[PDB]
């Protein structure tokens, strides 16, 4: 059995509000990152989350060089944002066919909004799906470089991604990775 987004089968608050952002693919050589990154919508309940993800494109539909970002409200998905500037990202690159992208992304989002893999003293500020020619990437953006909290998060993220080998998860400070798991 597999989890799916679309319904081909008392509100429930989330710990924080979240905003979904998109990086558009450029149509020319003039558009900049600041032109391409746009906020989409915000949500703060499970019901709102499901309504959004059932009414936006699935990962397998997205074009090369686009991104989805889901970040806690008042945090931009940018290394320059105050909340991210002392942190980094755990990133996994799915090389190969990647037929599991939609389910991997759903599982990642559920684990992020559900607060299950973050530390209680929160590290995770957001999560990013990046569509790239050499393989799509999944990344958790953290507020710090604190090693033991990062290793706890990283080990849980590997389980969410159903990774069984080692060396697949790499931590890149927002300043070659500094940790590999």
């Amino acid at each position: 059995p597999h989890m799916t987004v679309l319904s081909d089968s008392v509100k429930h608050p989330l710990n924080t509000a979240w905003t979904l952002w998109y990086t558009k693919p450029a149509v020319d050589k003039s558009e900049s990152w600041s032109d391409l990154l746009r906020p989409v919508t915000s949500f703060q309940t499970v019901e709102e989350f499901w309504a959004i993800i059932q009414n936006i494109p699935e990962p397998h539909e997205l074009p090369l060089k686009s991104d989805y970002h889901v970040f806690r409200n008042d945090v931009r998905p940018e290394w320059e944002d105050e909340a991210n500037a002392k942190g980094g990202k755990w990133s996994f690159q799915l090389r190969g066919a990647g037929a599991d992208i939609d389910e991997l992304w759903l599982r990642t989002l559920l684990a992020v909004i559900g607060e299950t893999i973050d530390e209680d003293d929160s590290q995770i500020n957001g999560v990013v799906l990046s569509i790239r020619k050499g393989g799509n990437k999944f990344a958790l953006w953290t507020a710090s470089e604190d090693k033991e909290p990062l290793l706890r998060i990283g080990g849980k993220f590997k389980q969410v991604l159903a990774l069984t080998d080692d060396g697949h998860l790499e931590f890149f400070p927002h300043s070659q990775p500094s940790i590999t798991l």
Partner: protein, 64 residues
């Protein structure tokens, strides 16, 4: 190779101090709307949120 039977899907941290709201993956997946709650019985407030989302042109799906 993810599967719904993966034990991660039932995990949630307990005895939290900072956060009230945490949910396992399975708890969240159980809250997926039914077909009716996503259409002809959708909460009108949720309908307003869906209607505020961008039109399909926003995503530039044809830009390879």
């Amino acid at each position: 190779g993810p599967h719904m039977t993966d034990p991660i899907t039932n995990y949630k941290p307990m005895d939290l101090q900072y956060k009230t709201y945490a949910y396992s993956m399975n708890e969240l997946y159980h809250l997926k709307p039914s077909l009716a709650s996503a259409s002809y019985e959708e909460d009108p407030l949720i309908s307003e949120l869906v209607r505020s989302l961008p039109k399909r042109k926003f995503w530039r799906l044809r830009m390879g």
